[PDB]
Design a protein around this nucleic acid. Sequence first.
RNA 1: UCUUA
Length: 112
Amino acid sequence: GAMAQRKGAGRVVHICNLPEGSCTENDVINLGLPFGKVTNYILMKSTNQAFLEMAYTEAAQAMVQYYQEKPAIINGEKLLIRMSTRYKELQLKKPGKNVAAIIQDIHSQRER
RNA sequence: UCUUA
């Protein structure tokens, strides 16, 4: 274990291909939550990229494997979720809303 | 593609 990067005591999962003006916290996490509980997330509207932190490394690999064959489409752009090669941990420099509520958002689908 | 324009 811990051979393929130190994604255990600290995980960085990077999501990309998010359009500026369309990089919402809810949707990025909407991808995260159904495969695993989202503990942290970071949206970088500037680089059209984002970070998604998950409860277990198993979730990170699962999402990557899924979106490799079935990508997430935002504004007609396929999102690419991958494990970051440069960073081991995500620290929230910017605060966010309750992520559990985002689970309710996912279940609501289109504001049920 | 890699800390929030």
